[PDB]
């Protein structure tokens, strides 16, 4: 019942794939997406933009990578996201923190099952 179907939480180092592949495909599929570089409010505090994205979206996609887990905004977003619903994507191999080590994720790195990645992602969002 939220304005956006999904918010995308990601590190700037992964922007190329996130914007040109993930957001591109989501929007083509009719999925309404909050993306910081378009939808953040300039002059709001970081925490305000985090909260706007989370509370106005049904779920938060978490784009896991080594750079995600070194990024302050990503961590703060994730912590609040755990109190709602998240869709973790393993985009690049990394050390996944203990509190995510028992959560099912969509594994982009597993090339042989890549043929079902988008099906699975879109199904969850639409469910």
């Amino acid at each position: 019942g939220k304005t956006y179907d999904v918010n995308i939480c990601y590190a700037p180092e992964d922007r190329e794939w996130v914007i040109n592949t993930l957001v591109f495909k989501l929007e083509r599929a009719g999925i309404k997406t909050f993306v910081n570089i378009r939808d953040d409010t300039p002059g709001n505090f970081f925490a305000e933009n985090i909260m706007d994205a989370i509370e106005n979206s049904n779920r938060t996609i978490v784009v896991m990578s080594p750079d995600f887990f070194k990024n302050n905004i990503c961590d703060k977003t994730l912590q609040i996201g755990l109190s709602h619903q998240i869709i973790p994507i393993l985009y690049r191999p990394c050390e996944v923190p203990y509190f995510l080590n028992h959560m099912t994720y969509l594994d982009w790195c597993d090339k042989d099952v890549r043929p079902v990645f988008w099906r699975n992602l879109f199904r969850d969002i639409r469910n």
Partner: peptide
């Protein structure tokens, strides 16, 4: 359907 909501997670969890």
């Amino acid at each position: 359907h909501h997670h969890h």
